[PDB]
Design a binder for this molecule. Structure first.
Ligand code: HOT
Length: 275
């Protein structure tokens, strides 16, 4: 029953090509799937895995099969009847959002960037409504397709700089701590992948946040977008927007795009005197 929303794939339909990462107990590969061949990512569970690892692996496949949304990574299927077991997802040539924006600095319009954020927010609204707390939302966990559509994923791992204070302090992870993380993602997108808090150490980040400091506005950032990320970073969990509010706000800004022309004042870190 754990695999009720998943398609079982026969191993003869899968070819593994290059290792692209590691799982908890097995490699992740780029490969091809027959069912004209479709590129896929393939996470394996290799011989010797523990009972806990098997339960976590098939549980991961199960929840991924349950999710069916434009802005959540698509599960092609699972291999559970043969060894090694496999989780097989779609593949994106553009890759992860953090590296994508750092390699494409300044190449998009404000409307394109805000559209990315709306898609991420819609995927998160779906997850939260499905009672799934992500716990590791960050641009590194978002894939970008060749239509610029962002797909929330979870590639596995402490992301202090993305994590809400209550989650750091007492391990309270909820959809409202995911909203904090979403605010950080907004900042990542609007800066083309800058490092949150720059060179501050993890301890310095937490000290600054506890003292009320917040990331300053990105350059060229719509006022409404900076205001929204600031609301995501309310210290009091209950004061943060829900994902439904975030989607609604972003939709309204996109549909009346003149709203995005008003920019938040950027605080220069360096002034040049010239005549
Ligand atoms: C195979 C695979 C297995 C699981 C997941 C995953 O998201 N599970 C997940 C679990 C809980 C909640 C959610 C959810 F949806 F709620 F968020 C999602 C993604 C991929 N697929 C994949 N993994 C990678 N990795 C993983 C290893 C890492 O080291 C390197 C990157 N890369 C690419 N990839 C690259 C370019 N195009 C596609 N695809």
């Amino acid at each position: 029953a754990v695999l009720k929303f998943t398609t079982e794939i026969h191993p003869s339909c899968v070819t593994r090509q290059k290792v692209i990462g590691a799982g908890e107990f097995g490699e992740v590969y780029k490969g091809m799937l027959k069912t004209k061949e479709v590129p896929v990512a393939i996470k394996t569970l290799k011989a010797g895995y523990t009972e806990k690892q098997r339960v976590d692996f098939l549980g991961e496949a199960g929840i991924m099969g349950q999710f069916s949304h434009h802005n959540i990574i698509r599960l092609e299927g699972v291999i559970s009847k043969y060894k090694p077991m496999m989780i097989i997802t779609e593949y994106m040539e553009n890759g992860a959002l953090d590296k994508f924006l750092r390699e494409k600095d300044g190449e998009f319009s404000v409307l394109q960037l805000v559209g990315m954020l709306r898609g991420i927010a819609a995927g998160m609204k779906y997850l939260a409504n499905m009672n799934y707390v992500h716990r590791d939302l960050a641009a590194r966990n978002i894939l970008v397709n060749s239509n610029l559509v962002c797909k929330v994923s979870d590639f596995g791992l402490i992301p202090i700089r993305w994590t809400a204070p209550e989650a750091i302090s007492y391990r309270k992870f909820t959809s409202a701590s995911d909203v904090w993380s979403f605010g950080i993602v907004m900042w990542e997108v609007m800066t083309y992948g800058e490092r949150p808090y720059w060179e501050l150490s993890n301890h310095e980040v937490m000290k600054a946040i506890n003292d009320g400091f917040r990331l300053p506005t990105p350059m060229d950032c719509p006022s409404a977008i900076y205001q929204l990320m600031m609301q995501c970073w309310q210290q009091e969990r209950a004061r943060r927007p829900k994902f439904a509010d975030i989607v609604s706000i972003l939709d309204k800004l996109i549909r009346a795009p003149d709203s995005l022309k008003t920019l938040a004042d950027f605080d220069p870190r360096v002034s040049i005197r010239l005549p």
